[PDB]
Design a protein around this nucleic acid. Structure first.
Ligand SMILES: O=Cc1c2[nH]c3ccccc3c2cc2[nH]c3ccccc3c12
Lengths: 288, 327
DNA sequence: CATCGGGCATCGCGTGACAAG
DNA sequence: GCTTGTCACGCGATGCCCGAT
């Protein structure tokens, strides 16, 4: 409808919006500077005033750290990939783990975690991104910590390493720099003949509230009511004597809400088609 | 000369002096346009005013010079350990702040994002969701535009805290979202994209592994000893494939050949990887001796395709889950 | 104590030049 | 060879300042 006029009008309104944006930004500046109705040049000169006073990165290092910590907590730690030796730990370790900056220094990440986890720690430290879940200590008491970090070449650029520094003789080649933060259905599962979860169906979440990683490695009897524990144990012991035969047992499984749920478990054995030996026990666990 | 041009020249002089003081590298300041000069001046002032009231160190018991140097970078260290970026969004859905690493994950320049609408970065179908999260702790997912493709799904974990020192009108502070955005973890799956990657494994008659080639170590992640110390191969099989593998093992026992089967193996990362395998019986003096399985790794797409076109229909066919393996 | 006319400064508008994409 | 956006410019309508009433 007369392209030349459409182009003209839309261009006119475009820089009309531009002028309005400029005026609005100047008004914000007027709202945000000290001394302040003044005109545009006054506000701009006082903005130069304030910005010269306040002053590369948009934030300082402490402002960036403040933003991150306000966002999602966490404490930073930097350990050597060789021995797990704690090179650095932030003060955030006190509000996160209730531990002084001092218990981690001169120490080792393996000494700060649960023993049953140290192996996994080696897994995460041997030889970019890393993400794991462990138990760190705060009788001793431990707590689940989600750790997210990366492998960095050591020493870091910019930081001066003096001669008489304790870090001067270590000479580690790689480091882990990470943040640690505190954080009517049925499902199938596979166990060894002792009762340890070796395979967990995802539906367990909708069934008992646990995630599969919370069940794998644990014996099922650990989740059973103390009065039903021997019954479930003998169910497991009998299903091994009767190859292929199905055994059902009802017991109380403690959901992660620490609530007792009545569950029916049907168990049988998987036989190796050549040797007829047992590979594992298949259980189907249903709510009641 | 003339008065209009005089006034415009004074305005441009003040604008250039504002640009000179912006806390950005010179190559970023030179490419800036006057409107975004004003925009990031305003944003810097708002940030400094918030930090003036909300903000304010090694333990002197454990202070060395090297530790002081590391403490002076603690913030950037946290930012790098985030595996993502920081976002602080006002109630007007304005980006109060975004860290530089947003460019690492979406391709947007930090100076182009700050003090701009957040919805310009978020997929339309998700914008509504984001709004509901803006109005204490917060944990959700959103698809943000990724100029490195085009979108990327990301988990936002954050909180709603009062954004002090904004001097609105005087109105009280409003709740801003302080969150960390991190990419979405792909499902616990391993898909070798290196083409032409067929690998062979050797087993004894009960499918307990005894040997494996280099590509097998690369895909499965076990050392040669590690493969043979964790029971038979049935300790490595996804529970949705155990019965099919047992049937094909019986077929190989009866005919020497198993036929092409598709199933999932457990890596050392405890991930599942698809393989189309074929098991042959080798003989010694006319009696079966060991098994030679030759496997070709598959993607998740064609793996689920093969599963959906399954010949036999056995129990646990559509089950999904996780597993562990011990020696 | 105002009110009133100068001359220049602010200010908003539409258009044309120019370039990155 | 087209789209969008930035920048300068001309151009008047009001603003501010201030002798002069
Ligand atoms: O134990 C079944 C198995 C198998 N177990 C493994 C453990 C580690 C590495 C490789 C394998 C492996 C390869 C296989 N290829 C097969 C074809 C037909 C039937 C069964 C299989 C089978």
């Amino acid at each position: 409808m007369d392209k030349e006029r459409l182009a003209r009008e839309n261009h006119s309104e475009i820089e009309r919006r531009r002028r309005n944006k400029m005026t609005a930004y100047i008004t914000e500046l007027s709202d945000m500077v000290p001394t302040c109705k003044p005109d545009k040049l006054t506000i701009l000169r006082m903005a130069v005033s304030h910005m010269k006073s306040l002053r590369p990165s948009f934030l300082t290092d402490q402002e960036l750290k403040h933003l991150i910590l306000e966002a999602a907590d966490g404490f930073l730690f930097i350990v050597s990939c060789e021995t797990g030796r704690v090179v650095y730990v932030s003060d955030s370790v006190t509000p996160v783990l209730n531990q002084p900056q001092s218990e981690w220094f001169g120490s080792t990440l393996y000494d700060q975690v649960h023993p049953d986890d140290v192996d996994k720690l080696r897994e995460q430290l041997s030889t970019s991104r890393r993400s794991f879940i462990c138990r760190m200590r705060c009788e001793p008491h431990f707590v689940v910590v989600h750790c997210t970090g990366y492998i960095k070449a050591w020493p870091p650029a910019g930081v001066s390493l003096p001669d008489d520094d304790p870090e001067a003789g270590q000479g580690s080649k790689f480091c882990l720099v990470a943040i640690g933060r505190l954080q009517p259905t049925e499902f199938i599962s596979r166990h060894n003949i002792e009762g340890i979860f070796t395979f967990v169906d995802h539906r367990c979440v909708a069934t008992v509230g646990y995630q599969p990683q919370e069940l794998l490695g644990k014996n099922i009897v650990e989740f059973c009511h103390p009065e039903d524990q021997q019954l479930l144990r003998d169910s497991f012991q009998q299903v091994v004597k009767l190859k292929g035969q199905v055994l059902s047992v009802m017991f109380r499984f403690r959901s992660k809400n620490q609530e007792w749920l009545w569950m029916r478990t049907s168990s049988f054995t998987f036989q190796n088609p050549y040797s007829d030996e047992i590979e594992y026990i298949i259980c189907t666990n249903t709510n009641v | 000369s003339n008065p209009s041009k005089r006034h415009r020249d004074r305005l441009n002089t003040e604008l250039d002096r504002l640009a000179s003081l912006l806390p950005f590298p010179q190559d970023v300041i030179n490419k800036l346009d006057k409107l975004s000069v004003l925009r990031l001046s305003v944003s810097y002032l708002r940030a400094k005013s918030f930090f003036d009231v909300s903000l304010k160190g090694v333990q002197d018991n454990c202070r060395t010079k090297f530790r002081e140097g590391l403490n002076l970078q603690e913030g950037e260290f946290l930012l790098q350990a985030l595996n993502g970026f920081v976002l602080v969004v006002t109630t007007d859905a304005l980006v109060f702040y975004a860290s530089s690493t947003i460019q690492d994950y979406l391709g947007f320049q930090q100076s182009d994002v700050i003090h701009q609408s957040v919805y310009e970065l978020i997929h339309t179908e998700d914008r509504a969701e984001f709004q509901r999260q803006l109005h204490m702790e917060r944990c959700f997912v959103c698809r943000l535009r990724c100029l490195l493709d085009g979108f990327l799904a990301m988990n936002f974990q954050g909180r709603l805290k009062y954004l002090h020192g904004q001097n609105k009108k005087i109105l009280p502070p409003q709740l801003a979202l302080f969150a960390i955005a991190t990419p979405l973890q792909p499902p616990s799956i391993l898909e070798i994209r290196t083409k032409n990657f067929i690998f062979r494994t050797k087993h004894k008659l009960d499918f307990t592994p005894t040997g494996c080639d280099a590509k097998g170590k690369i895909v499965l992640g076990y050392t040669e000893a590690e493969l043979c110390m964790r029971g038979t191969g049935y300790q490595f099989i996804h529970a949705a494939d155990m019965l099919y593998c047992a049937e094909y093992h019986v077929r190989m026992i009866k005919t020497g050949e198993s036929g092409m089967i598709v199933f999932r193996l457990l890596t050392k990362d405890n991930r599942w990887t698809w393989v189309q395998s074929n098991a042959r019986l080798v003989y010694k003096n006319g009696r079966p001796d060991y098994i030679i399985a030759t496997q070709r790794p598959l993607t998740d797409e064609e793996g689920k395709e093969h599963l959906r076109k399954r010949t036999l229909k056995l129990p646990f066919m559509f089950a999904t889950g996780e597993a562990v393996l011990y020696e």
